[PDB]
Design a protein around this nucleic acid. Structure first.
Ligand SMILES: [Mg+2]
Ligand SMILES: [Mg+2]
Ligand SMILES: [Mg+2]
Ligand SMILES: [Mg+2]
Ligand SMILES: [Mg+2]
Ligand SMILES: [Mg+2]
Ligand SMILES: [Mg+2]
Ligand SMILES: [Mg+2]
Ligand SMILES: [Mg+2]
Ligand SMILES: [Mg+2]
Ligand SMILES: [Mg+2]
Ligand SMILES: [Mg+2]
Ligand SMILES: [Mg+2]
Ligand SMILES: [Mg+2]
Ligand SMILES: [Mg+2]
Ligand SMILES: [Mg+2]
Ligand SMILES: [Mg+2]
Ligand SMILES: [Mg+2]
Ligand SMILES: [Mg+2]
Ligand SMILES: [Mg+2]
Ligand SMILES: [Mg+2]
Ligand SMILES: [Mg+2]
Ligand SMILES: [Mg+2]
Ligand SMILES: [Mg+2]
Ligand SMILES: [Mg+2]
Ligand SMILES: [Mg+2]
Ligand SMILES: [Mg+2]
Ligand SMILES: [Mg+2]
Ligand SMILES: [Mg+2]
Ligand SMILES: [Mg+2]
Ligand SMILES: [Mg+2]
Ligand SMILES: [Mg+2]
Ligand SMILES: [Mg+2]
Ligand SMILES: [Mg+2]
Ligand SMILES: [Mg+2]
Ligand SMILES: [Mg+2]
Ligand SMILES: [Mg+2]
Ligand SMILES: [Mg+2]
Ligand SMILES: [Mg+2]
Ligand SMILES: [Mg+2]
Ligand SMILES: [Mg+2]
Ligand SMILES: [Mg+2]
Ligand SMILES: [Mg+2]
Ligand SMILES: [Mg+2]
Ligand SMILES: [Mg+2]
Ligand SMILES: [Mg+2]
Ligand SMILES: [Mg+2]
Ligand SMILES: [Mg+2]
Ligand SMILES: [Mg+2]
Ligand SMILES: [Mg+2]
Ligand SMILES: [Mg+2]
Ligand SMILES: [Mg+2]
Ligand SMILES: [Mg+2]
Ligand SMILES: [Mg+2]
Ligand SMILES: [Mg+2]
Ligand SMILES: [Mg+2]
Ligand SMILES: [Mg+2]
Ligand SMILES: [Mg+2]
Ligand SMILES: [Mg+2]
Ligand SMILES: [Mg+2]
Ligand SMILES: [Mg+2]
Ligand SMILES: [Mg+2]
Ligand SMILES: [Mg+2]
Ligand SMILES: [Mg+2]
Ligand SMILES: [Mg+2]
Ligand SMILES: [Mg+2]
Ligand SMILES: [Mg+2]
Ligand SMILES: [Mg+2]
Ligand SMILES: [Mg+2]
Ligand SMILES: [Mg+2]
Ligand SMILES: [Mg+2]
Ligand SMILES: [Mg+2]
Ligand SMILES: [Mg+2]
Ligand SMILES: [Mg+2]
Ligand SMILES: [Mg+2]
Ligand SMILES: [Mg+2]
Ligand SMILES: [Mg+2]
Ligand SMILES: [Mg+2]
Ligand SMILES: [Mg+2]
Ligand SMILES: [Mg+2]
Ligand SMILES: [Mg+2]
Ligand SMILES: [Mg+2]
Ligand SMILES: [Mg+2]
Ligand SMILES: [Zn+2]
Lengths: 229, 112
RNA sequence: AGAGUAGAUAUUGUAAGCUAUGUUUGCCACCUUCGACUCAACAUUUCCUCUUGGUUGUAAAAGCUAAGAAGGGUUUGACUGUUCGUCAAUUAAAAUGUUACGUGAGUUGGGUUAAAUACGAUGUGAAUCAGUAUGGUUCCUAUCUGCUGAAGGAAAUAUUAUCAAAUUAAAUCUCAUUAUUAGUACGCAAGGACCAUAAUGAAUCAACCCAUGGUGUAUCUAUUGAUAAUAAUAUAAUAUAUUUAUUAAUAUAUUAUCUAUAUUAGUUUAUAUUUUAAUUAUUAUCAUAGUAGAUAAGCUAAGUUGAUAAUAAAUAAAUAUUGAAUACAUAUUAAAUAUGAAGUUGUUUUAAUAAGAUAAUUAAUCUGAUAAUUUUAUACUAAAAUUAAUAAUUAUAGGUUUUAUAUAUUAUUUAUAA
RNA sequence: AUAAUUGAGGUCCCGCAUGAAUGACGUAAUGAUACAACAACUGUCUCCCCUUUAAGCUAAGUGAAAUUGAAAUCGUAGUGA
RNA sequence: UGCUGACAUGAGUAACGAAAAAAAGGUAUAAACCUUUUCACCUAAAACAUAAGGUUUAACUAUAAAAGUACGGCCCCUAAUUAAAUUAAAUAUAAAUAUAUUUAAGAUGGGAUAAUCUAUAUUAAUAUUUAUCUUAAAAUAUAUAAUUAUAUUAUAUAUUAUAUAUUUAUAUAAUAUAAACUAAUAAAGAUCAGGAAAAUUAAUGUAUACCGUAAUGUAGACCGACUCAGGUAUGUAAGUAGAGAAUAUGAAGGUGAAUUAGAUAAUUAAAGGGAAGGAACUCGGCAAAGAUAGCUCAUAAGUUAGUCAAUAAAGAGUAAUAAGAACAAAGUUGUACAACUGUUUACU
RNA sequence: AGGUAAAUAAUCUAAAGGGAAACAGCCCAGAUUAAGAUAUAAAGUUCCUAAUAAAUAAUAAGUGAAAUAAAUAUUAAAAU
RNA sequence: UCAUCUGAUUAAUUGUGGUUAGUAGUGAAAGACAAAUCUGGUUUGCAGAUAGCUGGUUUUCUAUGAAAUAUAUGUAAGUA
RNA sequence: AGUAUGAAAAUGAUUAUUUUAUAAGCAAUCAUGAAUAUAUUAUAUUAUAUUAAUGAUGUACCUUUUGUAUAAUGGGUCAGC
């Protein structure tokens, strides 16, 4: 009751409802901006919900599965824009995370908001698809977009990629088919380059992407450690 | 409960500015953004790049505006007859001039 | 003087004598709130505990009186506004003061106190009272001092990281009962020890949460009323596909479960008619967390554990040795030589400080800070943990997995199958 | 009556200084009146503990007040309107 | 404790006024504005209609539309009351003025016709307060015309079928829920005994004036120096529940706010729970705790005879046995004073 | 009684300066403005703090050293 | 304000307007109310009321410089 | 509440000089080092100015009083009256 979670200056009933709302909004819009403390708590709920959904999907035990389903239903507000949220959770969202052991969200810190000095953050879903089956781009996966923008900037400057950028790319890849990842990167480039107004020679960009993928995939002192005399 | 004397210039100033707690600190923890080579806070996203990405998302993930057929295919004269102009209130006018009271985000300096 | 079986000075001490105190009642006029609660600090003129002198009135045991002694301790209830006092039950003892008769910018407001009112008395009366009774008004965010904690800056017998002694500031220091020595010493008997040790407690302090108890707006179950969802199923419409001969049948998606008319004015409900206008699973909200039964961590005392800090040194009152000055005597207010206290010094504990010590010394990873994730810590700070991802090793928080706990049904079961 | 009662009720009458429409006396009912007792109940207390929310604390924005001769505003004792 | 002005100090301290918010987008300008969705709060209101009031605050200047019928004023009429008014000499009076009488004013009240829709002008001529019972009537069932038990009992309209004037009129018959509520009717109980004032036929008329109308109105738009937890009149106030306008929920509607974000030490406030004890607290049980039906039964002493005491205490039935919404319901007694219900120091 | 009432003198009142630790009233002494060599007042002369050396006795109690505490007791010392 | 408590068909609560007040009304009577408070409102004027009382009264230099006693006083805070 | 002007002060921020982190009280005066600044006769071993090394002395002002550092009166500061 003290120390188990953030209180967030709200009465228990209100607080829980707020958290549910945040979770619903995260599932609907695959990224959302909010205050840091709220985002952190919301992540805990959303991740829990995702795991329950995964458990329901996997389990052979019918009673268990039903219980998981009931728990998931309890943890959401299913109305208006979230009428078919349960369906989405089972069919669209939870199947992304079957191989991933936890860590389905990422809370990314922003510069604190000016009017309030409140620490601001971006709660968002990990490995959200950047491109739907229709020829558009999807709202979400901000980190990936930022990475690709950084890559583009490095290419423009004719500089080597930073170790941190490479590490991030590797992390992104870990639960991604290589060809799919490449195609996503290419898609992101097309939009990003146009926004920034750099020229998109396609074959060269593809080659660069391929090169970036290759280095990611193929893995390759002051004090001396000496035994006791 | 109540101050016994007029607090002097010295004693108010050493109270306010003497302690380091009360002073402002240099923001040493700035560093370069990898997407655009500009200043940003450490362990923080660049507000320009994330803003740009948000804008991109908005432009792509855009719910189409509902333009009713009957109003779209009105004649100009007919439209004027139906929906004439009006004097807005002082309050309304003030609300309309958003640039007076609404702060747009500033760009940081380019890192060296 | 005089009591004290005898003897003024064991104990008592008329009236008169000489002082101290500033604790009472006064006097002076420089100067214009009693009690309770809470927390106490100081004194010693000591009530208890430790040491000791006297006590034909110290046999013993209880006492009485006096000297040293302030380390520790010194009460709970009935009555009353009361301090006090009376009593009850305890205690080793229930000491006396000082501190603006400590403490109302810390609490209270029963007493005292103004407005209302009544009673007894006083007065022709308005009204009055060293009277009685019921009722009844002040508030304050802390500038400075001070104190409790916590940081930053700093000058360091010159650096940093760590370990740190003397020292300083405080804390602590006990007491009872029982048992043994011993029914011994002592005493006719009745009664009944010192010296000393141990074990149980005590009051106080400190830490702790394994367990116990409490809590537990983590959680789970049960449960009354009202409302609102999702899913499934049925019906209907629209949109998209497939079959069929735009229609019908199928599949997917979305939306819908209304509506209108009758029953003599109005409202609601009911049924009938009208319409495609559905009843099961599972959720949620609200009603003090809706109420109730349990309940993890944490925190806590009703709980648990430990401590009351020795040995030692010099002393107080007091008790001696030898021994003159002073042929004796005299513990010395002589030279020498000894005993002696819950006190003193210390010891023990905490905080502060940092003499000293080990090491490294312009740095591909020197030491710190800013930043992030945090809790072992915490108002903010500070402190401590981690900031791994390369040749090795290091998990901070969440998430995940795990076993375990909680909840409450469960072998009338779960999983594999034949 | 209570372990124990300056309170309460009953009774006595040196009524300091009761008494008959400034009414006297005893009742039923009533009373947010005043005092006392019993029951039940309880954090009132023994003896406090845990929890909740709003403040307090920190950051951002806005922004009081009484007060103030001037202040570089320590302890003790003594002195002294 | 001079007056006026300016500027300090406390201090960037307290405070920012009962409050539930979240996301996405308008907008790579939003904690605060607008929209959408979610969540919550008010709901015999924080809703919807209005009265009064007011810097028009409004959905605004291209601005709140009336001949009259569940439209108000204006107008007619008057109450309370008011009037340099009214009557050789109304009466009185140092002046001012006052009195009596007339006339005039004066709403908080009364005022014809109307969905068949309705016609207001001019001229002429003679109602305090409360109640709807019982009986009786017929209707529906049980038993053998008459008894027993149960509802129904004055009015409010559409339908169908008849009989008369001639598909429009009049009357009759039959058909048809419950619970509230309205108006209009009738009969009538009680003492406290219940406003005032302004005709009818006939003929001729009637081209329908002025003002109010926004929004706000248990409130940021009025009265409180403030966008002030105060004060402020009336009517509707979805259903489910109930004796109910109590209480719970909330369909719809409205709202979520000139402060936010975090942290939740000490400490304060307002709540929830608490082992063993149970008033040991305290001036004092102050505060808190305490309800084993709310319906139907039953209910003592005393007593002024009044179920006054009584809503008696205890207790029963229905319900429930481990408990499991809110709200109503919080003991018994003795004494002093005052019969009682009332009134009082607006702010001790 | 730092009391009260008057008598006499002084000071303060209205008087600064030195001393009395600090000091309205006590001990000295009266600031016209400076200067700082010489006489000094009261009070002082180990240091704080301007200035000191001696003589003869007494005390041993830190008595006392600028605010004298009594009756009485004990121990000495002189003189008769 | 919250909780708690009391009345709630009556000597009830309340809207709209009216009457009665500054020697002065209303008052189930408290000296209670009469426009944020009355043993008698407010405003304007008499009016610069009066105050033996409190406080204040503004540059410099120079010379002299007290008193706090007696008597009287409805006088002992004054005045001769 | 005219119009110009405004190095009037209180008051705020900033810079410069100087002093200040082992020192205690009306924050001044006098003694006295040091540092800085200015100086068309500093010829210098110079002169002025500014500045809490260090030392000594120093109980705000007024009012009212027998008598006030008084913890008696009155004043937040400056400008005008
Ligand atoms: Mg709730
Ligand atoms: Mg939960
Ligand atoms: Mg004798
Ligand atoms: Mg005697
Ligand atoms: Mg005295
Ligand atoms: Mg003694
Ligand atoms: Mg003995
Ligand atoms: Mg000791
Ligand atoms: Mg006292
Ligand atoms: Mg005090
Ligand atoms: Mg005080
Ligand atoms: Mg009372
Ligand atoms: Mg010991
Ligand atoms: Mg434990
Ligand atoms: Mg347990
Ligand atoms: Mg526990
Ligand atoms: Mg009807
Ligand atoms: Mg249907
Ligand atoms: Mg509700
Ligand atoms: Mg001898
Ligand atoms: Mg001998
Ligand atoms: Mg000892
Ligand atoms: Mg790393
Ligand atoms: Mg870990
Ligand atoms: Mg590892
Ligand atoms: Mg982890
Ligand atoms: Mg008695
Ligand atoms: Mg009592
Ligand atoms: Mg008589
Ligand atoms: Mg009489
Ligand atoms: Mg009487
Ligand atoms: Mg009454
Ligand atoms: Mg702030
Ligand atoms: Mg003096
Ligand atoms: Mg002045
Ligand atoms: Mg402050
Ligand atoms: Mg503060
Ligand atoms: Mg605050
Ligand atoms: Mg936005
Ligand atoms: Mg209600
Ligand atoms: Mg008229
Ligand atoms: Mg009217
Ligand atoms: Mg209106
Ligand atoms: Mg309207
Ligand atoms: Mg309205
Ligand atoms: Mg209001
Ligand atoms: Mg107003
Ligand atoms: Mg006000
Ligand atoms: Mg209702
Ligand atoms: Mg709703
Ligand atoms: Mg509204
Ligand atoms: Mg607000
Ligand atoms: Mg208990
Ligand atoms: Mg119990
Ligand atoms: Mg007591
Ligand atoms: Mg008691
Ligand atoms: Mg009570
Ligand atoms: Mg009877
Ligand atoms: Mg009740
Ligand atoms: Mg009465
Ligand atoms: Mg009152
Ligand atoms: Mg005298
Ligand atoms: Mg004089
Ligand atoms: Mg003198
Ligand atoms: Mg003289
Ligand atoms: Mg002279
Ligand atoms: Mg001495
Ligand atoms: Mg002396
Ligand atoms: Mg009646
Ligand atoms: Mg009176
Ligand atoms: Mg007034
Ligand atoms: Mg009055
Ligand atoms: Mg005159
Ligand atoms: Mg005058
Ligand atoms: Mg006089
Ligand atoms: Mg002279
Ligand atoms: Mg004289
Ligand atoms: Mg005189
Ligand atoms: Mg120094
Ligand atoms: Mg100082
Ligand atoms: Mg002072
Ligand atoms: Mg003063
Ligand atoms: Mg003053
Ligand atoms: Zn950038």
């Amino acid at each position: 009751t003290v120390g188990i979670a953030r209180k967030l200056s709200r009465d228990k009933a209100h607080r829980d409802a707020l958290l549910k709302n945040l979770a619903c909004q995260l599932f609907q819009h695959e990224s959302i901006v909010s205050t840091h403390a709220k985002c952190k708590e919301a992540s805990r709920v959303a991740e829990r919900i995702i795991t329950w959904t995964k458990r329901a999907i996997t389990t052979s035990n019918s009673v268990a599965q039903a219980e998981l389903k009931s728990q998931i239903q309890s943890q959401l507000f299913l109305a208006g824009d979230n009428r078919k949220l349960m369906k989405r959770l089972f069919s669209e969202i939870a199947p992304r995370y079957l191989e991933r052991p936890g860590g389905y969200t990422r809370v990314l810190r922003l510069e604190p908001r000016a009017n309030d000095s409140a620490p601001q953050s971006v709660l968002e879903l990990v490995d959200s698809p950047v491109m739907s089956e229709s020829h558009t781009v999807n709202r979400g996966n901000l980190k990936m977009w930022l990475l690709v923008k950084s890559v583009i900037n490095d290419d423009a400057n004719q500089l080597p990629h930073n170790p941190l950028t490479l590490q991030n790319l590797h992390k992104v890849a870990k639960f991604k088919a290589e060809a799919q990842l490449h195609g996503e990167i290419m898609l992101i480039k097309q939009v990003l380059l146009k926004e920034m107004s750099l020229p998109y020679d396609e074959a060269l960009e593809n080659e660069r992407t391929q090169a970036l993928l290759k280095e990611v995939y193929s893995s390759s002192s002051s004090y001396v450690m000496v035994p006791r005399p | 409960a109540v101050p016994k004397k007029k607090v002097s210039h010295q004693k108010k100033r050493q109270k306010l500015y003497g302690p380091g707690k009360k002073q402002l600190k240099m923001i040493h923890h700035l560093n370069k953004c990898p997407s655009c080579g500009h200043y940003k806070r450490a362990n923080t996203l660049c507000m320009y790049c994330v803003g740009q990405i948000s804008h991109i998302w908005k432009t792509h993930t855009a719910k189409e505006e509902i333009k009713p057929r009957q109003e779209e295919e009105l004649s100009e004269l007919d439209q004027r007859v139906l929906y004439p102009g009006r004097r807005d209130t002082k309050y309304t006018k003030d609300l309309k001039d958003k640039d007076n009271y609404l702060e747009r985000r500033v760009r940081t300096l380019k890192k060296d």
